[PDB]
């Protein structure tokens, strides 16, 4: 059957639920920022200035 | 939820006595040093370093 081993991500404290197996790991920053798309003008050079 | 993991240890609260029956200042140090003995012993059984 299965192999006995360690549970490094499960929380097995006193009086604490252990139904999640990824509770002690952290969330990290990806490395890219989603900025809005740029806008451009069209009438800059089509009249008298 | 008084422990981190079961089988490691809890905290200790010790009573000294009534307040109206310790008028003399030297009648309070006796109780204090008489209750510090149990506090000394309850910290060693949890393997707390000295």
PDB file of N, CA and C in Angstrom:
ATOM      1  N   UNK A   1       0.826  -1.200   0.000  1.00  0.00           N
ATOM      2  CA  UNK A   1       0.000   0.000   0.000  1.00  0.00           C
ATOM      3  C   UNK A   1       0.864   1.255   0.000  1.00  0.00           C
ATOM      4  N   UNK A   2       0.485   2.234   0.816  1.00  0.00           N
ATOM      5  CA  UNK A   2       1.200   3.497   0.870  1.00  0.00           C
ATOM      6  C   UNK A   2       2.442   3.377   1.747  1.00  0.00           C
ATOM      7  N   UNK A   3       3.254   4.423   1.724  1.00  0.00           N
ATOM      8  CA  UNK A   3       4.516   4.473   2.460  1.00  0.00           C
ATOM      9  C   UNK A   3       4.379   5.498   3.579  1.00  0.00           C
ATOM     10  N   UNK A   4       4.666   5.137   4.830  1.00  0.00           N
ATOM     11  CA  UNK A   4       4.643   6.136   5.905  1.00  0.00           C
ATOM     12  C   UNK A   4       5.707   7.204   5.697  1.00  0.00           C
ATOM     13  N   UNK A   5       5.379   8.427   6.078  1.00  0.00           N
ATOM     14  CA  UNK A   5       6.272   9.540   5.867  1.00  0.00           C
ATOM     15  C   UNK A   5       5.848  10.769   6.632  1.00  0.00           C
ATOM     16  N   UNK A   6       6.439  11.901   6.260  1.00  0.00           N
ATOM     17  CA  UNK A   6       6.264  13.160   6.965  1.00  0.00           C
ATOM     18  C   UNK A   6       5.231  14.034   6.266  1.00  0.00           C
ATOM     19  N   UNK A   7       4.499  14.805   7.065  1.00  0.00           N
ATOM     20  CA  UNK A   7       3.530  15.781   6.571  1.00  0.00           C
ATOM     21  C   UNK A   7       4.025  17.169   6.967  1.00  0.00           C
ATOM     22  N   UNK A   8       4.741  17.833   6.055  1.00  0.00           N
ATOM     23  CA  UNK A   8       5.318  19.139   6.345  1.00  0.00           C
ATOM     24  C   UNK A   8       4.328  20.273   6.118  1.00  0.00           C
ATOM     25  N   UNK A   9       3.198  20.006   5.469  1.00  0.00           N
ATOM     26  CA  UNK A   9       2.242  21.054   5.175  1.00  0.00           C
ATOM     27  C   UNK A   9       0.938  20.980   5.945  1.00  0.00           C
ATOM     28  N   UNK A  10       0.750  19.933   6.738  1.00  0.00           N
ATOM     29  CA  UNK A  10      -0.470  19.745   7.509  1.00  0.00           C
ATOM     30  C   UNK A  10      -0.297  20.330   8.905  1.00  0.00           C
ATOM     31  N   UNK A  11      -1.367  20.933   9.420  1.00  0.00           N
ATOM     32  CA  UNK A  11      -1.370  21.562  10.736  1.00  0.00           C
ATOM     33  C   UNK A  11      -1.974  20.593  11.743  1.00  0.00           C
ATOM     34  N   UNK A  12      -1.143  20.085  12.651  1.00  0.00           N
ATOM     35  CA  UNK A  12      -1.591  19.094  13.620  1.00  0.00           C
ATOM     36  C   UNK A  12      -1.420  19.594  15.048  1.00  0.00           C
ATOM     37  N   UNK A  13      -1.828  20.837  15.307  1.00  0.00           N
ATOM     38  CA  UNK A  13      -1.816  21.377  16.648  1.00  0.00           C
ATOM     39  C   UNK A  13      -2.990  20.878  17.469  1.00  0.00           C
ATOM     40  N   UNK A  14      -3.050  21.347  18.711  1.00  0.00           N
ATOM     41  CA  UNK A  14      -4.103  20.948  19.635  1.00  0.00           C
ATOM     42  C   UNK A  14      -5.341  21.800  19.391  1.00  0.00           C
ATOM     43  N   UNK A  15      -6.469  21.143  19.132  1.00  0.00           N
ATOM     44  CA  UNK A  15      -7.707  21.856  18.888  1.00  0.00           C
ATOM     45  C   UNK A  15      -7.778  22.566  17.556  1.00  0.00           C
ATOM     46  N   UNK A  16      -7.030  22.100  16.561  1.00  0.00           N
ATOM     47  CA  UNK A  16      -6.977  22.727  15.248  1.00  0.00           C
ATOM     48  C   UNK A  16      -7.304  21.703  14.172  1.00  0.00           C
ATOM     49  N   UNK A  17      -8.118  22.110  13.202  1.00  0.00           N
ATOM     50  CA  UNK A  17      -8.512  21.210  12.128  1.00  0.00           C
ATOM     51  C   UNK A  17      -7.343  20.954  11.182  1.00  0.00           C
ATOM     52  N   UNK A  18      -7.257  19.718  10.697  1.00  0.00           N
ATOM     53  CA  UNK A  18      -6.191  19.336   9.792  1.00  0.00           C
ATOM     54  C   UNK A  18      -6.687  18.774   8.478  1.00  0.00           C
ATOM     55  N   UNK A  19      -7.761  19.353   7.939  1.00  0.00           N
ATOM     56  CA  UNK A  19      -8.341  18.888   6.688  1.00  0.00           C
ATOM     57  C   UNK A  19      -7.675  19.463   5.447  1.00  0.00           C
ATOM     58  N   UNK A  20      -6.765  20.419   5.598  1.00  0.00           N
ATOM     59  CA  UNK A  20      -6.044  21.000   4.475  1.00  0.00           C
ATOM     60  C   UNK A  20      -4.581  20.577   4.532  1.00  0.00           C
ATOM     61  N   UNK A  21      -4.052  20.137   3.391  1.00  0.00           N
ATOM     62  CA  UNK A  21      -2.705  19.583   3.316  1.00  0.00           C
ATOM     63  C   UNK A  21      -1.693  20.565   2.735  1.00  0.00           C
ATOM     64  N   UNK A  22      -2.056  21.841   2.618  1.00  0.00           N
ATOM     65  CA  UNK A  22      -1.163  22.866   2.084  1.00  0.00           C
ATOM     66  C   UNK A  22      -1.256  24.135   2.921  1.00  0.00           C
ATOM     67  N   UNK A  23      -1.399  23.984   4.236  1.00  0.00           N
ATOM     68  CA  UNK A  23      -1.727  25.116   5.093  1.00  0.00           C
ATOM     69  C   UNK A  23      -0.510  25.896   5.571  1.00  0.00           C
ATOM     70  N   UNK A  24       0.674  25.285   5.606  1.00  0.00           N
ATOM     71  CA  UNK A  24       1.849  25.923   6.187  1.00  0.00           C
ATOM     72  C   UNK A  24       2.824  26.440   5.135  1.00  0.00           C
ATOM     73  N   UNK A  25       2.404  26.528   3.878  1.00  0.00           N
ATOM     74  CA  UNK A  25       3.225  27.075   2.808  1.00  0.00           C
ATOM     75  C   UNK A  25       2.785  28.504   2.505  1.00  0.00           C
ATOM     76  N   UNK A  26       3.655  29.250   1.829  1.00  0.00           N
ATOM     77  CA  UNK A  26       3.470  30.680   1.632  1.00  0.00           C
ATOM     78  C   UNK A  26       3.206  31.016   0.168  1.00  0.00           C
ATOM     79  N   UNK A  27       2.632  32.197  -0.048  1.00  0.00           N
ATOM     80  CA  UNK A  27       2.394  32.751  -1.374  1.00  0.00           C
ATOM     81  C   UNK A  27       3.461  33.788  -1.709  1.00  0.00           C
ATOM     82  N   UNK A  28       3.897  33.791  -2.968  1.00  0.00           N
ATOM     83  CA  UNK A  28       5.064  34.566  -3.376  1.00  0.00           C
ATOM     84  C   UNK A  28       4.699  35.502  -4.526  1.00  0.00           C
ATOM     85  N   UNK A  29       5.613  36.401  -4.885  1.00  0.00           N
ATOM     86  CA  UNK A  29       5.410  37.406  -5.924  1.00  0.00           C
ATOM     87  C   UNK A  29       5.928  36.874  -7.254  1.00  0.00           C
ATOM     88  N   UNK A  30       5.127  37.027  -8.311  1.00  0.00           N
ATOM     89  CA  UNK A  30       5.469  36.430  -9.600  1.00  0.00           C
ATOM     90  C   UNK A  30       6.638  37.151 -10.255  1.00  0.00           C
ATOM     91  N   UNK A  31       6.476  38.439 -10.546  1.00  0.00           N
ATOM     92  CA  UNK A  31       7.548  39.196 -11.159  1.00  0.00           C
ATOM     93  C   UNK A  31       7.111  40.103 -12.289  1.00  0.00           C
ATOM     94  N   UNK A  32       5.806  40.188 -12.539  1.00  0.00           N
ATOM     95  CA  UNK A  32       5.283  41.027 -13.608  1.00  0.00           C
ATOM     96  C   UNK A  32       4.086  41.817 -13.104  1.00  0.00           C
ATOM     97  N   UNK A  33       3.932  43.036 -13.616  1.00  0.00           N
ATOM     98  CA  UNK A  33       2.853  43.940 -13.234  1.00  0.00           C
ATOM     99  C   UNK A  33       1.981  44.197 -14.456  1.00  0.00           C
ATOM    100  N   UNK A  34       0.663  44.097 -14.276  1.00  0.00           N
ATOM    101  CA  UNK A  34      -0.298  44.279 -15.365  1.00  0.00           C
ATOM    102  C   UNK A  34      -0.774  45.726 -15.368  1.00  0.00           C
ATOM    103  N   UNK A  35      -0.174  46.541 -16.230  1.00  0.00           N
ATOM    104  CA  UNK A  35      -0.570  47.934 -16.379  1.00  0.00           C
ATOM    105  C   UNK A  35      -1.539  48.091 -17.546  1.00  0.00           C
ATOM    106  N   UNK A  36      -2.318  49.169 -17.505  1.00  0.00           N
ATOM    107  CA  UNK A  36      -3.354  49.388 -18.505  1.00  0.00           C
ATOM    108  C   UNK A  36      -2.741  49.718 -19.865  1.00  0.00           C
ATOM    109  N   UNK A  37      -3.512  49.455 -20.916  1.00  0.00           N
ATOM    110  CA  UNK A  37      -3.073  49.714 -22.279  1.00  0.00           C
ATOM    111  C   UNK A  37      -3.052  51.214 -22.559  1.00  0.00           C
ATOM    112  N   UNK A  38      -2.107  51.634 -23.395  1.00  0.00           N
ATOM    113  CA  UNK A  38      -1.887  53.053 -23.643  1.00  0.00           C
ATOM    114  C   UNK A  38      -2.910  53.619 -24.623  1.00  0.00           C
ATOM    115  N   UNK A  39      -3.003  54.947 -24.643  1.00  0.00           N
ATOM    116  CA  UNK A  39      -3.906  55.684 -25.517  1.00  0.00           C
ATOM    117  C   UNK A  39      -3.097  56.694 -26.317  1.00  0.00           C
ATOM    118  N   UNK A  40      -3.514  56.955 -27.552  1.00  0.00           N
ATOM    119  CA  UNK A  40      -2.802  57.861 -28.439  1.00  0.00           C
ATOM    120  C   UNK A  40      -3.758  58.848 -29.097  1.00  0.00           C
ATOM    121  N   UNK A  41      -3.228  60.027 -29.411  1.00  0.00           N
ATOM    122  CA  UNK A  41      -3.978  61.105 -30.038  1.00  0.00           C
ATOM    123  C   UNK A  41      -3.747  61.110 -31.546  1.00  0.00           C
ATOM    124  N   UNK A  42      -4.706  61.685 -32.272  1.00  0.00           N
ATOM    125  CA  UNK A  42      -4.740  61.551 -33.726  1.00  0.00           C
ATOM    126  C   UNK A  42      -4.765  62.902 -34.433  1.00  0.00           C
ATOM    127  N   UNK A  43      -5.226  63.946 -33.749  1.00  0.00           N
ATOM    128  CA  UNK A  43      -5.421  65.251 -34.371  1.00  0.00           C
ATOM    129  C   UNK A  43      -4.259  66.209 -34.136  1.00  0.00           C
ATOM    130  N   UNK A  44      -3.096  65.705 -33.723  1.00  0.00           N
ATOM    131  CA  UNK A  44      -2.015  66.584 -33.285  1.00  0.00           C
ATOM    132  C   UNK A  44      -1.484  67.443 -34.427  1.00  0.00           C
ATOM    133  N   UNK A  45      -1.378  66.873 -35.626  1.00  0.00           N
ATOM    134  CA  UNK A  45      -0.738  67.570 -36.735  1.00  0.00           C
ATOM    135  C   UNK A  45      -1.662  67.701 -37.939  1.00  0.00           C
ATOM    136  N   UNK A  46      -2.907  68.116 -37.711  1.00  0.00           N
ATOM    137  CA  UNK A  46      -3.882  68.216 -38.791  1.00  0.00           C
ATOM    138  C   UNK A  46      -4.685  69.509 -38.715  1.00  0.00           C
ATOM    139  N   UNK A  47      -4.125  70.555 -38.109  1.00  0.00           N
ATOM    140  CA  UNK A  47      -4.775  71.860 -38.069  1.00  0.00           C
ATOM    141  C   UNK A  47      -3.716  72.919 -37.784  1.00  0.00           C
ATOM    142  N   UNK A  48      -4.172  74.153 -37.578  1.00  0.00           N
ATOM    143  CA  UNK A  48      -3.293  75.315 -37.478  1.00  0.00           C
ATOM    144  C   UNK A  48      -2.915  75.548 -36.022  1.00  0.00           C
ATOM    145  N   UNK A  49      -1.619  75.724 -35.769  1.00  0.00           N
ATOM    146  CA  UNK A  49      -1.083  75.923 -34.425  1.00  0.00           C
ATOM    147  C   UNK A  49      -0.243  77.194 -34.418  1.00  0.00           C
TER     148      UNK A  49
ATOM    149  N   UNK B   1      -7.314  24.736  23.918  1.00  0.00           N
ATOM    150  CA  UNK B   1      -6.204  25.158  23.076  1.00  0.00           C
ATOM    151  C   UNK B   1      -5.085  25.740  23.922  1.00  0.00           C
ATOM    152  N   UNK B   2      -4.769  25.089  25.039  1.00  0.00           N
ATOM    153  CA  UNK B   2      -3.783  25.609  25.973  1.00  0.00           C
ATOM    154  C   UNK B   2      -2.378  25.068  25.740  1.00  0.00           C
ATOM    155  N   UNK B   3      -2.149  24.330  24.658  1.00  0.00           N
ATOM    156  CA  UNK B   3      -0.833  23.806  24.326  1.00  0.00           C
ATOM    157  C   UNK B   3      -0.568  23.996  22.839  1.00  0.00           C
ATOM    158  N   UNK B   4       0.716  23.997  22.477  1.00  0.00           N
ATOM    159  CA  UNK B   4       1.093  23.985  21.064  1.00  0.00           C
ATOM    160  C   UNK B   4       0.854  22.601  20.468  1.00  0.00           C
ATOM    161  N   UNK B   5       1.545  21.600  20.998  1.00  0.00           N
ATOM    162  CA  UNK B   5       1.356  20.204  20.626  1.00  0.00           C
ATOM    163  C   UNK B   5       1.102  19.419  21.903  1.00  0.00           C
ATOM    164  N   UNK B   6       0.184  18.460  21.826  1.00  0.00           N
ATOM    165  CA  UNK B   6      -0.176  17.678  23.001  1.00  0.00           C
ATOM    166  C   UNK B   6       1.039  16.932  23.539  1.00  0.00           C
ATOM    167  N   UNK B   7       1.248  17.019  24.847  1.00  0.00           N
ATOM    168  CA  UNK B   7       2.372  16.372  25.486  1.00  0.00           C
ATOM    169  C   UNK B   7       3.590  17.235  25.732  1.00  0.00           C
ATOM    170  N   UNK B   8       3.481  18.557  25.605  1.00  0.00           N
ATOM    171  CA  UNK B   8       4.616  19.445  25.829  1.00  0.00           C
ATOM    172  C   UNK B   8       4.513  20.281  27.096  1.00  0.00           C
ATOM    173  N   UNK B   9       3.319  20.731  27.478  1.00  0.00           N
ATOM    174  CA  UNK B   9       3.171  21.466  28.721  1.00  0.00           C
ATOM    175  C   UNK B   9       2.205  22.633  28.680  1.00  0.00           C
ATOM    176  N   UNK B  10       1.771  23.092  29.854  1.00  0.00           N
ATOM    177  CA  UNK B  10       0.821  24.188  29.995  1.00  0.00           C
ATOM    178  C   UNK B  10       1.426  25.272  30.882  1.00  0.00           C
ATOM    179  N   UNK B  11       0.623  26.285  31.191  1.00  0.00           N
ATOM    180  CA  UNK B  11       1.013  27.364  32.086  1.00  0.00           C
ATOM    181  C   UNK B  11       0.476  27.106  33.491  1.00  0.00           C
ATOM    182  N   UNK B  12       1.052  27.808  34.467  1.00  0.00           N
ATOM    183  CA  UNK B  12       0.781  27.557  35.878  1.00  0.00           C
ATOM    184  C   UNK B  12       0.297  28.836  36.544  1.00  0.00           C
ATOM    185  N   UNK B  13      -0.795  28.737  37.298  1.00  0.00           N
ATOM    186  CA  UNK B  13      -1.311  29.836  38.107  1.00  0.00           C
ATOM    187  C   UNK B  13      -1.426  29.346  39.545  1.00  0.00           C
ATOM    188  N   UNK B  14      -0.772  30.049  40.465  1.00  0.00           N
ATOM    189  CA  UNK B  14      -0.677  29.639  41.859  1.00  0.00           C
ATOM    190  C   UNK B  14      -1.269  30.713  42.759  1.00  0.00           C
ATOM    191  N   UNK B  15      -2.054  30.288  43.746  1.00  0.00           N
ATOM    192  CA  UNK B  15      -2.683  31.205  44.684  1.00  0.00           C
ATOM    193  C   UNK B  15      -1.851  31.338  45.952  1.00  0.00           C
ATOM    194  N   UNK B  16      -1.867  32.540  46.525  1.00  0.00           N
ATOM    195  CA  UNK B  16      -1.085  32.836  47.711  1.00  0.00           C
ATOM    196  C   UNK B  16      -1.926  32.823  48.986  1.00  0.00           C
ATOM    197  N   UNK B  17      -3.126  33.392  48.964  1.00  0.00           N
ATOM    198  CA  UNK B  17      -3.967  33.429  50.141  1.00  0.00           C
ATOM    199  C   UNK B  17      -4.897  34.624  50.143  1.00  0.00           C
ATOM    200  N   UNK B  18      -5.663  34.795  51.215  1.00  0.00           N
ATOM    201  CA  UNK B  18      -6.550  35.940  51.325  1.00  0.00           C
ATOM    202  C   UNK B  18      -5.745  37.208  51.590  1.00  0.00           C
ATOM    203  N   UNK B  19      -6.334  38.350  51.232  1.00  0.00           N
ATOM    204  CA  UNK B  19      -5.644  39.627  51.350  1.00  0.00           C
ATOM    205  C   UNK B  19      -5.802  40.282  52.713  1.00  0.00           C
ATOM    206  N   UNK B  20      -6.939  40.090  53.382  1.00  0.00           N
ATOM    207  CA  UNK B  20      -7.177  40.730  54.667  1.00  0.00           C
ATOM    208  C   UNK B  20      -6.422  40.073  55.814  1.00  0.00           C
ATOM    209  N   UNK B  21      -5.794  38.918  55.585  1.00  0.00           N
ATOM    210  CA  UNK B  21      -5.141  38.156  56.642  1.00  0.00           C
ATOM    211  C   UNK B  21      -3.621  38.257  56.584  1.00  0.00           C
ATOM    212  N   UNK B  22      -3.088  39.240  55.856  1.00  0.00           N
ATOM    213  CA  UNK B  22      -1.644  39.420  55.737  1.00  0.00           C
ATOM    214  C   UNK B  22      -1.224  40.854  56.042  1.00  0.00           C
ATOM    215  N   UNK B  23      -1.710  41.421  57.145  1.00  0.00           N
ATOM    216  CA  UNK B  23      -1.478  42.823  57.476  1.00  0.00           C
ATOM    217  C   UNK B  23       0.001  43.137  57.663  1.00  0.00           C
ATOM    218  N   UNK B  24       0.708  42.296  58.413  1.00  0.00           N
ATOM    219  CA  UNK B  24       2.113  42.544  58.683  1.00  0.00           C
ATOM    220  C   UNK B  24       2.933  42.397  57.400  1.00  0.00           C
ATOM    221  N   UNK B  25       3.825  43.350  57.116  1.00  0.00           N
ATOM    222  CA  UNK B  25       4.664  43.222  55.912  1.00  0.00           C
ATOM    223  C   UNK B  25       5.522  41.970  55.900  1.00  0.00           C
ATOM    224  N   UNK B  26       5.984  41.512  57.062  1.00  0.00           N
ATOM    225  CA  UNK B  26       6.805  40.314  57.158  1.00  0.00           C
ATOM    226  C   UNK B  26       5.977  39.035  57.181  1.00  0.00           C
ATOM    227  N   UNK B  27       4.652  39.147  57.161  1.00  0.00           N
ATOM    228  CA  UNK B  27       3.767  37.997  57.052  1.00  0.00           C
ATOM    229  C   UNK B  27       3.383  37.702  55.607  1.00  0.00           C
ATOM    230  N   UNK B  28       3.937  38.444  54.654  1.00  0.00           N
ATOM    231  CA  UNK B  28       3.695  38.254  53.229  1.00  0.00           C
ATOM    232  C   UNK B  28       4.877  37.629  52.509  1.00  0.00           C
ATOM    233  N   UNK B  29       6.101  38.003  52.886  1.00  0.00           N
ATOM    234  CA  UNK B  29       7.270  37.372  52.303  1.00  0.00           C
ATOM    235  C   UNK B  29       7.327  35.885  52.578  1.00  0.00           C
ATOM    236  N   UNK B  30       6.836  35.461  53.743  1.00  0.00           N
ATOM    237  CA  UNK B  30       6.775  34.036  54.045  1.00  0.00           C
ATOM    238  C   UNK B  30       5.926  33.300  53.018  1.00  0.00           C
ATOM    239  N   UNK B  31       4.725  33.814  52.743  1.00  0.00           N
ATOM    240  CA  UNK B  31       3.862  33.183  51.750  1.00  0.00           C
ATOM    241  C   UNK B  31       4.490  33.223  50.364  1.00  0.00           C
ATOM    242  N   UNK B  32       5.141  34.336  50.018  1.00  0.00           N
ATOM    243  CA  UNK B  32       5.738  34.447  48.688  1.00  0.00           C
ATOM    244  C   UNK B  32       6.840  33.410  48.494  1.00  0.00           C
ATOM    245  N   UNK B  33       7.741  33.270  49.465  1.00  0.00           N
ATOM    246  CA  UNK B  33       8.846  32.326  49.322  1.00  0.00           C
ATOM    247  C   UNK B  33       8.357  30.905  49.574  1.00  0.00           C
ATOM    248  N   UNK B  34       7.156  30.762  50.126  1.00  0.00           N
ATOM    249  CA  UNK B  34       6.588  29.439  50.275  1.00  0.00           C
ATOM    250  C   UNK B  34       5.876  28.965  49.026  1.00  0.00           C
ATOM    251  N   UNK B  35       5.443  29.905  48.191  1.00  0.00           N
ATOM    252  CA  UNK B  35       4.832  29.569  46.911  1.00  0.00           C
ATOM    253  C   UNK B  35       5.820  29.585  45.756  1.00  0.00           C
ATOM    254  N   UNK B  36       6.986  30.202  45.927  1.00  0.00           N
ATOM    255  CA  UNK B  36       8.013  30.120  44.897  1.00  0.00           C
ATOM    256  C   UNK B  36       8.622  28.726  44.775  1.00  0.00           C
ATOM    257  N   UNK B  37       8.530  27.898  45.819  1.00  0.00           N
ATOM    258  CA  UNK B  37       9.077  26.545  45.762  1.00  0.00           C
ATOM    259  C   UNK B  37       8.367  25.690  44.719  1.00  0.00           C
ATOM    260  N   UNK B  38       7.036  25.748  44.678  1.00  0.00           N
ATOM    261  CA  UNK B  38       6.284  24.971  43.698  1.00  0.00           C
ATOM    262  C   UNK B  38       6.539  25.495  42.290  1.00  0.00           C
ATOM    263  N   UNK B  39       6.676  26.815  42.151  1.00  0.00           N
ATOM    264  CA  UNK B  39       6.968  27.400  40.848  1.00  0.00           C
ATOM    265  C   UNK B  39       8.322  26.939  40.329  1.00  0.00           C
ATOM    266  N   UNK B  40       9.313  26.831  41.217  1.00  0.00           N
ATOM    267  CA  UNK B  40      10.616  26.320  40.798  1.00  0.00           C
ATOM    268  C   UNK B  40      10.513  24.890  40.283  1.00  0.00           C
ATOM    269  N   UNK B  41       9.728  24.046  40.953  1.00  0.00           N
ATOM    270  CA  UNK B  41       9.655  22.635  40.596  1.00  0.00           C
ATOM    271  C   UNK B  41       8.818  22.386  39.351  1.00  0.00           C
ATOM    272  N   UNK B  42       7.792  23.203  39.105  1.00  0.00           N
ATOM    273  CA  UNK B  42       6.922  22.974  37.957  1.00  0.00           C
ATOM    274  C   UNK B  42       7.558  23.351  36.625  1.00  0.00           C
ATOM    275  N   UNK B  43       8.657  24.102  36.632  1.00  0.00           N
ATOM    276  CA  UNK B  43       9.339  24.473  35.400  1.00  0.00           C
ATOM    277  C   UNK B  43      10.416  23.481  34.984  1.00  0.00           C
ATOM    278  N   UNK B  44      10.935  22.682  35.916  1.00  0.00           N
ATOM    279  CA  UNK B  44      11.927  21.664  35.598  1.00  0.00           C
ATOM    280  C   UNK B  44      11.326  20.429  34.942  1.00  0.00           C
ATOM    281  N   UNK B  45      10.119  20.031  35.339  1.00  0.00           N
ATOM    282  CA  UNK B  45       9.479  18.860  34.756  1.00  0.00           C
ATOM    283  C   UNK B  45       9.074  19.065  33.303  1.00  0.00           C
ATOM    284  N   UNK B  46       9.083  20.303  32.811  1.00  0.00           N
ATOM    285  CA  UNK B  46       8.869  20.594  31.401  1.00  0.00           C
ATOM    286  C   UNK B  46      10.173  20.790  30.645  1.00  0.00           C
ATOM    287  N   UNK B  47      11.310  20.496  31.274  1.00  0.00           N
ATOM    288  CA  UNK B  47      12.639  20.527  30.671  1.00  0.00           C
ATOM    289  C   UNK B  47      13.105  21.933  30.315  1.00  0.00           C
ATOM    290  N   UNK B  48      12.625  22.953  31.019  1.00  0.00           N
ATOM    291  CA  UNK B  48      13.050  24.331  30.784  1.00  0.00           C
ATOM    292  C   UNK B  48      14.467  24.502  31.317  1.00  0.00           C
ATOM    293  N   UNK B  49      15.413  24.969  30.508  1.00  0.00           N
ATOM    294  CA  UNK B  49      16.798  25.084  30.980  1.00  0.00           C
ATOM    295  C   UNK B  49      16.931  26.107  32.097  1.00  0.00           C
ATOM    296  N   UNK B  50      17.893  25.874  32.984  1.00  0.00           N
ATOM    297  CA  UNK B  50      18.153  26.772  34.105  1.00  0.00           C
ATOM    298  C   UNK B  50      19.210  27.785  33.688  1.00  0.00           C
TER     299      UNK B  50
END
